[PDB]
Ligand binder design. Structure first.
Ligand SMILES: [Cu+2]
Ligand SMILES: [Cu+2]
Lengths: 155, 157
């Protein structure tokens, strides 16, 4: 069903897995390509690790209200494709994802996920009685997988 | 880790399990839409999670349901005045919830408290293909949960 982009990675309070599988139909359609126009669905599985308790997250919890963008670059190429992910549910639960088309065809790509904190959408209790001790990250978190091979559908 | 006071009993509505609590007003960063700590009577919280029926939408039982739009309507019983207060999603030491600092504008006594829970709309997508998708669908009109004759008795803190 699901194919890893690479090994799972910890970054700050986040645990970030990247997977891909067949392109999907989404309701509403969102920002990404239609199923027939796409090569795959790409998905960032983002959850809190143990350090997330500093912001009030339980370990393993989905972290919502993030802003996630993927950068897809053919190795040796002068151009990078930028793809906004949206939050969504599949049968396997919440994630950030998008239908994606590899613009340079089958080959070796570098894949980066850029993960921005919630900002003014999501609040934090900061008082001592009920509050958390941590604060959201200010610089976007970057997870990168080198030498991902896109070899067409595996489904 | 801190004292929480009940608004009635936990209620199920659609795929949601909804409980209300309140406690001392809090400091929020950023401040959001609601009253400041020193201007409010309490912090009011809606704890919204998926029940067993939430699996139809791909939610795990008990998990927080994000991207909802939650508003509270607070009406003193016998009064025509209805206060409306938007809740925002946020984390406290006990985890995610929707909440706001609120003021009971008509003083001590009986209030009807309604939580109006709008579905995410264009903010949250659903896979709907057969292979990876879900067969449940979000609600067009808000889910409403109400506790009648909640008693505001003043701060214990
Ligand atoms: Cu998806
Ligand atoms: Cu709160």
């Amino acid at each position: 069903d699901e194919f890893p982009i690479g090994d799972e990675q910890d970054a700050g309070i986040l645990t970030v897995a990247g997977v891909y599988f067949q392109p999907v139909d989404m309701e509403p359609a969102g920002n990404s390509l239609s199923k027939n126009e796409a090569d795959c669905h790409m998905e960032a599985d983002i959850s809190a690790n143990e350090k997330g308790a500093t912001l009030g997250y339980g370990a393993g919890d989905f972290v919502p209200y993030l802003h996630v963008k993927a950068y897809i670059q053919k190795v040796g190429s002068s151009k990078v494709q930028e793809v906004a992910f949206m939050p969504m549910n599949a049968s396997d639960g919440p994630h950030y994802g998008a239908n994606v088309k590899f613009e340079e065809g089958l080959g070796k790509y570098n894949i980066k996920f850029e993960i921005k904190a919630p900002g003014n959408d999501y609040l934090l209790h900061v008082d001592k009685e009920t509050g958390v001790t941590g604060r959201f990250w200010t610089e976007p978190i970057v997870v990168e997988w080198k030498d991902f091979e896109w070899t067409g559908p595996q489904w």
